[PDB]
Amino acid sequence: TQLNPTQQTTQSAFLATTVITAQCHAILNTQFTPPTVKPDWFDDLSKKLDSAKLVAKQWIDDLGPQVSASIPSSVINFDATFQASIDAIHELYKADPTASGKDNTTVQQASQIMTALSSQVSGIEATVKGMNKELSDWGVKMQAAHDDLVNGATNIQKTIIDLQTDIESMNNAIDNNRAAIEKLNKDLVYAQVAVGVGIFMLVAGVALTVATAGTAAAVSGGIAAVGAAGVTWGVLQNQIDDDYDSIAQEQKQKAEDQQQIIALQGLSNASSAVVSAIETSTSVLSDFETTWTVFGNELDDVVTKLNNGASMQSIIMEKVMSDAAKNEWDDAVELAKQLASAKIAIETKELAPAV
Numbered sequence: 001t002q003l004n005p006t007q008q009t010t011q012s013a014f015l016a017t018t019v020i021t022a023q024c025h026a027i028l029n030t031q032f033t034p035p036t037v038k039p040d041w042f043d044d045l046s047k048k049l050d051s052a053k054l055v056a057k058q059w060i061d062d063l064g065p066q067v068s069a070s071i072p073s074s075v076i077n078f079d080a081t082f083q084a085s086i087d088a089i090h091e092l093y094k095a096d097p098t099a100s101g102k103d104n105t106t107v108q109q110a111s112q113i114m115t116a117l118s119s120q121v122s123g124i125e126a127t128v129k130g131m132n133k134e135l136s137d138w139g140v141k142m143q144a145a146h147d148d149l150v151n152g153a154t155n156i157q158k159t160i161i162d163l164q165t166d167i168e169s170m171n172n173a174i175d176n177n178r179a180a181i182e183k184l185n186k187d188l189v190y191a192q193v194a195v196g197v198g199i200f201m202l203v204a205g206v207a208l209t210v211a212t213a214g215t216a217a218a219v220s221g222g223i224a225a226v227g228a229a230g231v232t233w234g235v236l237q238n239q240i241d242d243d244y245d246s247i248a249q250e251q252k253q254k255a256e257d258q259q260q261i262i263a264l265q266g267l268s269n270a271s272s273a274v275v276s277a278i279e280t281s282t283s284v285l286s287d288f289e290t291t292w293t294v295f296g297n298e299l300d301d302v303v304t305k306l307n308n309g310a311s312m313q314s315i316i317m318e319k320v321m322s323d324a325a326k327n328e329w330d331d332a333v334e335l336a337k338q339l340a341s342a343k344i345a346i347e348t349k350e351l352a353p354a355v
């Protein structure tokens, strides 16, 4: 069975911010080690990686947990007043089911109940919008760091005239792998069934050189995918194998220092993935804001109707007052509670393509 509209935007928004977190961890799992003879460009490119890692940590340590928690708590924290409000309206109707007219006290109370509930929705709208603005601002900083890393690698790669053909091959495989991993994550974000509570993050370094992480001239690109009880470590290995198997063979033909230069775009695999995840999050956070805006305007419509002389009878038939809406809301709250307490596992490994 499928997610109802409020469930869908709740879950999608939350999973998308969880992908940002996963890819920030992937940035932190990106690394490279100088060759035995450290070249002119190493320190400056390393600083650019450090800058990307710094921005990643701001999300992991501060902004991320706050944005991600705001999505379910907006639903959870609205529940008590929403229920009491709808119950009060039902009770008003039961006591005076023919009440109509702006001077009728039942109408007046119903109007005041829905006006106050709408004012609460407007506050929630602003809260979500503010969160999406904080994400936006942070994402500008991450984009800057990403662009600087990309451009740094690109300029270095231009200066070694012999390797241009191998760099092209590596960067084709890198683009292929990025796209494949991105699809795994986007598929989850946009899934239309309940993900459950077994949500996890798979974070890998990917050897792009013969030299393993920590040894001279090594390059380790980062990848991450979110899944739930569908991503697996075996799936990630088969993709790495699919995309990089041939590059791993080619890299063995090259000197250690050369393999490193060929792999330098890998240092921004993780940050390109974070940039994509920022894109997706901004979109589904707008969808989530829209969930609240729609609801707010529905309540406003009830207020307008009452003030123009509508009967309570006409109001009790509206969508917001209906049994279906109550049951969808109740299901959205439950979904949101499960997300808010979900304990998201992080598993970290170092992977290499096949030989």
Ligand SMILES: C[As](C)(=O)[O-]
Pocket: 006, 291, 292, 294, 295, 328, 329, 332
């Ligand atoms: C009451 As609602 C935010 O699920 O439309």
